[PDB]
Design a protein around this motif. Sequence first.
Motif, PDB file in Angstrom:
ATOM      1  N   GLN A  14      -6.461  48.615  40.587  1.00  0.00           N
ATOM      2  CA  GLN A  14      -5.220  49.182  41.034  1.00  0.00           C
ATOM      3  C   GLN A  14      -5.219  49.418  42.568  1.00  0.00           C
ATOM      4  N   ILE A  15      -6.309  49.926  43.131  1.00  0.00           N
ATOM      5  CA  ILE A  15      -6.476  50.095  44.635  1.00  0.00           C
ATOM      6  C   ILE A  15      -6.157  48.770  45.320  1.00  0.00           C
ATOM      7  N   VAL A  16      -6.768  47.693  44.860  1.00  0.00           N
ATOM      8  CA  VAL A  16      -6.488  46.405  45.415  1.00  0.00           C
ATOM      9  C   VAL A  16      -5.034  46.008  45.234  1.00  0.00           C
ATOM     10  N   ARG A  17      -4.477  46.247  44.060  1.00  0.00           N
ATOM     11  CA  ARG A  17      -3.093  45.854  43.845  1.00  0.00           C
ATOM     12  C   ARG A  17      -2.200  46.546  44.854  1.00  0.00           C
ATOM     13  N   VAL A  18      -2.252  47.874  44.912  1.00  0.00           N
ATOM     14  CA  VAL A  18      -1.315  48.613  45.781  1.00  0.00           C
ATOM     15  C   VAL A  18      -1.521  48.291  47.284  1.00  0.00           C
ATOM     16  N   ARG A  75      -5.424  60.768  42.333  1.00  0.00           N
ATOM     17  CA  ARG A  75      -5.648  61.033  43.755  1.00  0.00           C
ATOM     18  C   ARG A  75      -7.164  61.143  44.031  1.00  0.00           C
ATOM     19  N   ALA A  76      -7.884  61.838  43.148  1.00  0.00           N
ATOM     20  CA  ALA A  76      -9.361  61.980  43.282  1.00  0.00           C
ATOM     21  C   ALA A  76     -10.091  60.633  43.256  1.00  0.00           C
ATOM     22  N   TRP A  77      -9.768  59.769  42.295  1.00  0.00           N
ATOM     23  CA  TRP A  77     -10.316  58.397  42.276  1.00  0.00           C
ATOM     24  C   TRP A  77      -9.965  57.644  43.546  1.00  0.00           C
ATOM     25  N   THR A  78      -8.726  57.790  44.028  1.00  0.00           N
ATOM     26  CA  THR A  78      -8.283  57.080  45.195  1.00  0.00           C
ATOM     27  C   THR A  78      -9.042  57.521  46.428  1.00  0.00           C
ATOM     28  N   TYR A 131      -6.397  54.771  55.360  1.00  0.00           N
ATOM     29  CA  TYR A 131      -5.275  55.635  55.770  1.00  0.00           C
ATOM     30  C   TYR A 131      -4.015  55.152  55.067  1.00  0.00           C
ATOM     31  N   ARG A 132      -3.962  53.863  54.745  1.00  0.00           N
ATOM     32  CA  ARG A 132      -2.876  53.381  53.884  1.00  0.00           C
ATOM     33  C   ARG A 132      -2.953  54.027  52.505  1.00  0.00           C
ATOM     34  N   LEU A 133      -4.140  54.119  51.889  1.00  0.00           N
ATOM     35  CA  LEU A 133      -4.284  54.802  50.560  1.00  0.00           C
ATOM     36  C   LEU A 133      -3.986  56.286  50.652  1.00  0.00           C
ATOM     37  N   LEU A 134      -4.474  56.972  51.694  1.00  0.00           N
ATOM     38  CA  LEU A 134      -4.138  58.379  51.854  1.00  0.00           C
ATOM     39  C   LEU A 134      -2.642  58.600  51.912  1.00  0.00           C
ATOM     40  N   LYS A 135      -1.935  57.778  52.668  1.00  0.00           N
ATOM     41  CA  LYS A 135      -0.546  57.946  52.765  1.00  0.00           C
ATOM     42  C   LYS A 135       0.157  57.654  51.404  1.00  0.00           C
ATOM     43  N   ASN A 146      -5.503  67.421  56.470  1.00  0.00           N
ATOM     44  CA  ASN A 146      -6.924  67.736  56.422  1.00  0.00           C
ATOM     45  C   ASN A 146      -7.805  66.543  56.040  1.00  0.00           C
ATOM     46  N   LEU A 147      -7.376  65.731  55.077  1.00  0.00           N
ATOM     47  CA  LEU A 147      -8.139  64.585  54.699  1.00  0.00           C
ATOM     48  C   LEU A 147      -8.115  63.514  55.815  1.00  0.00           C
TER      49      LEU A 147
END
Lengths: 341, 341
Positions: A14-18, A75-78, A131-135, A146-147
């Motif tokens: 899913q990380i890769v997909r998004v 969010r934790a996995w991400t 930073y793309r995933l954080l956003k 903070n993150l």
Amino acid sequence: YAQEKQDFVQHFSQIVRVLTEDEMGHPEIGDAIARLKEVLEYNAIGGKYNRGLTVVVAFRELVEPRKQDADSLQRAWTVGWCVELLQAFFLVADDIMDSSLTRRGQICWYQKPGVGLDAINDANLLEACIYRLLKLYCREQPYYLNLIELFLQSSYQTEIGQTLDLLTAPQGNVDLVRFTEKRYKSIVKYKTAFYSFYLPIAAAMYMAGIDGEKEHANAKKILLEMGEFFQIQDDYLDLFGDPSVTGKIGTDIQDNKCSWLVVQCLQRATPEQYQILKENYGQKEAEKVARVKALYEELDLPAVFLQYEEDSYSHIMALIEQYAAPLPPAVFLGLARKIYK
Amino acid sequence: YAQEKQDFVQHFSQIVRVLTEDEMGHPEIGDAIARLKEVLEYNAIGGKYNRGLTVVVAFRELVEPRKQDADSLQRAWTVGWCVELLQAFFLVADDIMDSSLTRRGQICWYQKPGVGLDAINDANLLEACIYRLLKLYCREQPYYLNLIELFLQSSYQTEIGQTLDLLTAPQGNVDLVRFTEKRYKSIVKYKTAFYSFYLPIAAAMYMAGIDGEKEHANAKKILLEMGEFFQIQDDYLDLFGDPSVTGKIGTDIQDNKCSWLVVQCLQRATPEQYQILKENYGQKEAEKVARVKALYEELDLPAVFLQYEEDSYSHIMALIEQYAAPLPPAVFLGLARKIYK
Ligand SMILES: CC(C)[C@H](C)c1[nH]c2ccc(-c3ccccc3)cc2c1CC(P(=O)(O)O)P(=O)(O)O
Ligand SMILES: CC(C)[C@H](C)c1[nH]c2ccc(-c3ccccc3)cc2c1CC(P(=O)(O)O)P(=O)(O)O
């Protein structure tokens, strides 16, 4: 412990997909997004995932169980995967800088035909993905800033550590006057301990609404000390570990590394021993690596290490006793158990 | 115009000081901080400072004059210097990737004896310096998060653009089927226009409390179009410009660049001309570069360019007319004047 790892890895898809959804939202950059996918897949998979998983484990141990809905856990996995991306960025780049051949048992990314120094930009992309995933996942959360600051600061600390290491231990130039204990500890703290141990627990803390300066400092004190022992143990095992248990067959001595072992050796060596080190450290020939290793055993460095591991474990337990509260000591003890196994 | 530049450069000394204050606050990392200083001084100085200065000029044109105290102006200079650091990060890294020899008339950083591929970590430090300056100077301001996200996004866009360029134009492999107009515009938009034109004006906008999505989009439309013409003009001047007026003696054709010129050439070429290009583009020999350049002039590419510059200027003026409000048109017209001079 390692059922959670299969779950972590399955989330990658899913990380890769998004991150590569732009393959058709803007068609023009499709080929670049395809390349990003290949970069992600080659460089973020194949490690042991200890840093990312620590985010998830620590998150689950810190948050009230009826604030662990599906979106929280996601969010934790991400954010775990963000720590892994940061690791991937550092390793791709470090491999280029060190001229390494392999990593995680496969050819280094930059050594792949057709990649080469383009890997420098691949590494920057891996960093940017954090930073793309954080956003994408965390922008509406109270800990978002903070993150972002924690990942930026962890990158700076790591880079500064790398600078220090590069100055201290330049390949093909032996200078043992550089390899002092104060310098070794400084490299380890900045280059390894901050991102490997402080970063993932701090991130879990912020996600759990634990944002206090004081608590972060307390946990940092424990965690940077643990990180120091982790690297020292890594240095020891490089040369003295069983390779079917580590995976490594070590090359610290050939690579002119500021290892804990060479530091200890230098503290204990007669001038005649200093000479053996000078003539054999940081060279390719097997007989020369044998010499150094023989010198290490003559000075009983394994006995020093074993003693040092004992004193270190007691000290870590005392730090936990003094600085864990109000965090549950299990957050730190889980790490202590892995490190001191 | 260029009295403001002397003032911008004089501010560098303080940027360097505050970034390397850790030389004695933590003594251990002193040598690394000394190296950071040398990296900053070699790579952030020597350019024309157009991107950084645009932040300051645009800030002064956007803010109410009795909210331009000493601290405001200082934040504006600092954020200008951030844009310059981002530029420095990209150039150090691009030079390594392209195997370039010189930059800004001096040896490239990575070519310096003793640097080499360590420049990869130097570049990462330059990037990291941006976020250290943002935090030091802007952390209490309402636009802090907006600026951090703007710099992160500008880095991603630029990197993605670089990926696209690397795939499109790999050195030592001529494939002109890649060099299409849609691809050229896409490279320029992502690799150059976003960070060079959108980034500095957007940053000034955020600093002026102009945070609206719609206004940012309006300004972006103007600015990405301007950026496209800037690069097209850069491509044209690479080959046809007077070198005592540009500084450049061009090597786009030798370097197998996806230049606007080769794109235009390919659109107009007979198959016999396509062949001349195939046999001579992307090669070292002077007589071969002469061939391509002769082909360009035979197809009247300078006349095409001159026409294209005219149509482009009218279009930019129309975009300004339609999308500048409520920003003062002078913000955009200052840029138009420099670009179309
Ligand atoms: C498997 C053991 C033979 C080995 C010595 C070990 N011990 C660890 C103890 C703790 C951790 C760890 C836990 C959380 C965060 C970071 C590291 C990793 C390792 C590791 C693996 C480390 P290593 O390969 O030793 O540096 P990795 O970087 O996670 O792959
Ligand atoms: C000096 C001219 C012969 C030259 C063609 C020019 N024209 C410009 C017009 C606008 C800008 C600019 C303005 C704001 C932000 C970015 C660029 C730069 C240049 C530049 C200099 C550019 P260049 O060296 O052409 O790519 P730089 O990257 O700022 O050094």
